[PDB]
Design an enzyme around this catalytic site. Sequence first.
Site, PDB file in Angstrom:
ATOM      1  CB  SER A 196      -0.994  -0.242   1.239  1.00  0.00           C
ATOM      2  OG  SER A 196      -1.435   1.263   1.414  1.00  0.00           O
ATOM      3  CE1 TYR A 234      -4.303  -1.961   4.713  1.00  0.00           C
ATOM      4  CE2 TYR A 234      -3.490   0.193   4.090  1.00  0.00           C
ATOM      5  CZ  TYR A 234      -4.364  -0.771   3.929  1.00  0.00           C
ATOM      6  OH  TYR A 234      -3.846  -1.240   2.358  1.00  0.00           O
TER       7      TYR A 234
END
Lengths: 214, 214
Positions: free
Chosen positions: B132, B146
């Site tokens: 990501s 995250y």
Amino acid sequence: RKTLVLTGASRGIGHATVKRFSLAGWRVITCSRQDGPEDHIKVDLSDPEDIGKAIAEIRRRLEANGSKLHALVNNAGISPKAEGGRRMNSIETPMAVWRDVFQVNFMAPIMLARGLFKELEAAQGSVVNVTSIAGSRVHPFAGTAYATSKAALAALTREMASDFGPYGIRVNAIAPGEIDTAILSGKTSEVAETIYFLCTETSSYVTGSEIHIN
Amino acid sequence: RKTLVLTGASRGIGHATVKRFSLAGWRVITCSRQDGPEDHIKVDLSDPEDIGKAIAEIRRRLEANGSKLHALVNNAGISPKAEGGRRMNSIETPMAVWRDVFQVNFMAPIMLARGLFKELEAAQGSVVNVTSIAGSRVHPFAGTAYATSKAALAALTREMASDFGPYGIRVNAIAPGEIDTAILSGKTSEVAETIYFLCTETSSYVTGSEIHIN
């Protein structure tokens, strides 16, 4: 007196860091798994109950210095070996080792910083996370749990800088040029000098940075 | 028939990936927390007992395809919100959330790859970990657990490539240009196309790479 809490005060980078801050006149509180007594904290950083106990004891000790913590340096790090001293890779690392290595290398830095938040804020202090070249390249001396936890610690440092900034607390990382010998069976002076820089007035405006020692 | 096991088969990247592989003639086995039935596996990737159950069931299903797994794509990812839908930062994330987010985002990819190792080896297959932009920059839409777990997953991908290489299994990451909408309250086609590339003959020699979609 300015105060430092240092984890991973082992031979090499740890000693060099304790020496530099001591000679600069700071109070240095070291944390280690092993037993001036007012300046050592025995703590197992793989154990969240013990980290809570250490944080509370550090807060009591800092009452002498006006409940101010000018620096928290997270230098503890583990890299458990596989059978017969072998490097432990992604296929062979058991769940327990991923857990304990991320707890010591990655969770303890943020548990300590937020546990000691009132005192870091009172001092408008500095947090330094020591990262590793293993966090960005595969190294024969560092297993996969160490590499990945150190990569996660660099990202945590970035996130912490963003979170702690509005409270006046700067957060930075340092990656030494070589693997820390403390995970094994001049350069260290330079790491200690850079940690000291990151904790003193010259780095007042520096946050969210990761310094790579050449 | 070539076989794909895909986690995180949600709307967006997941659907686009299932569609691309299906239209290319592959058998696609999706894994999700939710209930052709022979091609879905219900599994809670935060639960190591359930992951073991799913792996064993996937191995049984692959006996039909000669116990070969040509591709494992790890696209599951979670980013729990703080109270009232707020982004959860490093100060506010409880221990339980760090644990469960690293278990789904970071441990499940290696547990699945090593659990399915015999079948990936038999196929000389491919593992793709979806990383990501949050793994390298602070993002308003992605919390700290995250971000840090995705940074750790990029480093895991590098380490896995080194470990799996001598067995003939290539391992790569893809970071989409934007935050995956599946962690929220044309571009997806391009992510699915790149995952498909990484799982087919054109990428035979590509391993240890992280492709950033612009």
